[PDB]
């Protein structure tokens, strides 16, 4: 069901934090769109923080979902879940030990987020959420935006 909150968005994915809040990667959002989920884009309030893209809709869109906790990253050492959906529809939950929070430079651009280590990702996976459980509540910490071409290093864009 939480998987139902991940939906094809442009060249990547996005996630319904609530019935009205939708988050994605800044590299994924369709730049020349005049409508999202039937809503005129003029009616949608979009905020961009580096690679974190945040879409507040005027009315609730996903009335079936509940509002989730959204925070700027996770505590260091937290083993997070990277909920990756592939174009085939396959579900690919990946374990990632979250690392330090920082302003990072990625392909010349400045990105606020949190490094992680997979315990693979591909171009089409951007916009997919990082989530961990804290008590009884699941917590969204950000969206996938990059991965180093060396070893295991993923970037979760935050804020
Ligand atoms: C997701 C976005 C995408 O496909 O858009 C094309 C620009 C994609 C995911 C990676 C592709 C391969 N595997 C992935 O997980 N991300 C990108 O294309 C960003 C750039 C990268 O991922 C490079 N990675 C890095 O520079 C890097 C550095 C560190 C510590 O970690 N990763 C490639 C080596 C893949 C696009 C991007 C993101 C943010 C920016 F500020 C600029 C550019």
Author numbering: 4 to 122, 133 to 172
What do the study's own words say?
The protease plays a crucial role in viral replication by cleaving the polyprotein into individual nonstructural proteins. HuNoV proteases are cysteine proteases structurally similar to picornavirus 3C-like proteases with a chymotrypsin-like fold. Their active site features a catalytic triad with histidine-30 (H30) as the catalytic base, cysteine-139 (C139) as the catalytic nucleophile, and glutamic acid-54 (E54) as an acidic residue which orients and stabilizes the conformation of H30 (15).
To ascertain that similar conformational changes in the BII-CII loop occur in other GII-Pros in response to rupintrivir binding, we first determined the crystal structures of apo GII.4-Pro Sydney (2012 GII.4 variant) and GII.3-Pro to 2.4 Å and 2.6 Å, respectively, followed by their crystal structures in complex with rupintrivir to 2.5 Å and 2.71 Å resolution. These structures show that the BII-CII extends from the closed conformation to the same open position observed in GI.1-Pro. The R112 sidechain orients away from the active site, adopting a conformation similar to that observed in GI.1-Pro to accommodate the P2 sidechain of rupintrivir. Unlike the GII.4-Pro HOV-rupintrivir structure, the BII-CII loop is not involved in any crystal contact in these two structures. As a result, the BII-CII loop does not adopt the hyperextended conformation. While remaining the same in the GII.4-Pro Sydney and GII.3-Pro structures, this sidechain adopts a different conformation in the GII.4-Pro HOV structure with a hyperextended BII-CII loop. In GII-Pros, but not GI.1-Pro, the BII-CII loop switches from a closed state to an open state to accommodate rupintrivir. Interestingly, in the recently published structure of GII.4-Pro Sydney in complex with NV-004, a potent aldehyde-based inhibitor of the SARS-CoV-2 main protease with HuNoV protease inhibition activity, the BII-CII loop exists in a different conformation compared to our rupintrivir bound GII-Pro structures. In the NV-004 bound structure, the loop conformation results in a narrower S2 pocket and a wider S4 pocket, suggesting that in exchange for stability, the BII-CII loop matches its conformation to the bound ligand to attain the most favorable conformation.
